[PDB]
Amino acid sequence: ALTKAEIAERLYEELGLNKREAKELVELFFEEIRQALEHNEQVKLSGFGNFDLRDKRQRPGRNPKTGEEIPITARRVVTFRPGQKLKARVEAYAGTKS
Amino acid sequence: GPMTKSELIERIVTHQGQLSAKDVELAIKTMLEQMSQALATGDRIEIRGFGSFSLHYRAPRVGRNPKTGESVRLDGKFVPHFKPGKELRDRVNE
DNA sequence: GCAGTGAACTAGCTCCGAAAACCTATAACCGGTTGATTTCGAAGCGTTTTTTGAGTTTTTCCC
């Protein structure tokens, strides 16, 4: 996978900023994004998809391997909407399903 | 109100001022470029706590216009997807 | 332009201090299941905003 260690490496390589502080830079950006959504502060991005929080309603659930049914409680969960610029970048590649 | 990338730039710059402000935006738009490029190359994006951010596929289908309702053929394509990691999951779960 | 000084510089060294590079376990994430509920989206034009770029004026910092 792509890893924030690999971001720290890329940031050293391409910008030249030392990896020690680069790792803290990425992890702080990755922490403040969490702080925003944790506060229910919708995070809104352009040139990139963005971060919404959806209040899901009561839904039927199951044990898929037994067929037992369990209710799914209403909940607020984060939902990220890819943008058309990102979709256009991602639409086609390689030759196998993902 | 909502947070934006332009507001991220300034808030990071306040909580990590010891780094040059523009080394920060430089870093932050390059790292968004990096992750978007990784998706465009058909790769995971997996981390811990946060979650994982990944790819999915759509098969070709005959959709057509919500406005006009005129047949439109579509080829198979990939789309981004995101699952929140249980740490962020529970942080955003009030 | 001169007499004068002080700063930049030389090789190779052990020796010492530090950031760099590498190993490990494993908790979070990956994959598989069902299926009724909600969420998301096929085109594309107009509206609204970002965020990138664009210049720079001002402020702040360091010396």
Swiss-Prot record, chain A:
GO MF annotation terms: DNA binding; structural constituent of chromatin
A Pfam family annotated for this UniProt entry: Bac_DNA_binding
One GO BP: positive regulation of metabolic process
Keywords: DNA recombination, DNA-binding, Transcription, Transcription regulation, Translation regulation
Region (Disordered): 52-71
Recorded GO CC terms: cytosol
CDD domains, sorted: IHF_A
Signal peptide stretch: none
PROSITE patterns registered for this protein in UniProt: HISTONE_LIKE (PS00045)
Family recorded in the similarity comment: Belongs to the bacterial histone-like protein family.
Complex and partners: Heterodimer of an alpha and a beta chain.
Annotated NCBIfam families: himA (TIGR00987), PRK00285.1 (NF001401)
Biological function: This protein is one of the two subunits of integration host factor, a specific DNA-binding protein that functions in genetic recombination as well as in transcriptional and translational control.
Name this polypeptide is given: Integration host factor subunit alpha
Organism, scientific name: Pseudomonas aeruginosa (strain UCBPP-PA14)
From Swiss-Prot, chain B:
SMART domains noted in UniProt: BHL (SM00411)
Gene3D superfamilies linked: IHF-like DNA-binding proteins
Key word Chaperone present: no
Keywords: DNA recombination, DNA-binding, Transcription, Transcription regulation, Translation regulation
A GO biological-process term: DNA recombination
Pfam families reported in the protein's UniProt record: Bac_DNA_binding (PF00216)
Superkingdom of the source species: Bacteria
Record SUPFAM superfamilies: IHF-like DNA-binding proteins (SSF47729)
One annotated Gene Ontology cellular component of this protein: cytosol
A GO molecular-function descriptor: structural constituent of chromatin
Keyword Transcription attached: yes
Family: Belongs to the bacterial histone-like protein family.
PANTHER family membership: DNA-BINDING PROTEIN HU, INTEGRATION HOST FACTOR SUBUNIT BETA
Free-text function comment from the UniProt entry: This protein is one of the two subunits of integration host factor, a specific DNA-binding protein that functions in genetic recombination as well as in transcriptional and translational control.
Subunit note: Heterodimer of an alpha and a beta chain.
The protein, known as: Integration host factor subunit beta
Native species: Pseudomonas aeruginosa (strain UCBPP-PA14)
Gene that encodes it: ihfB
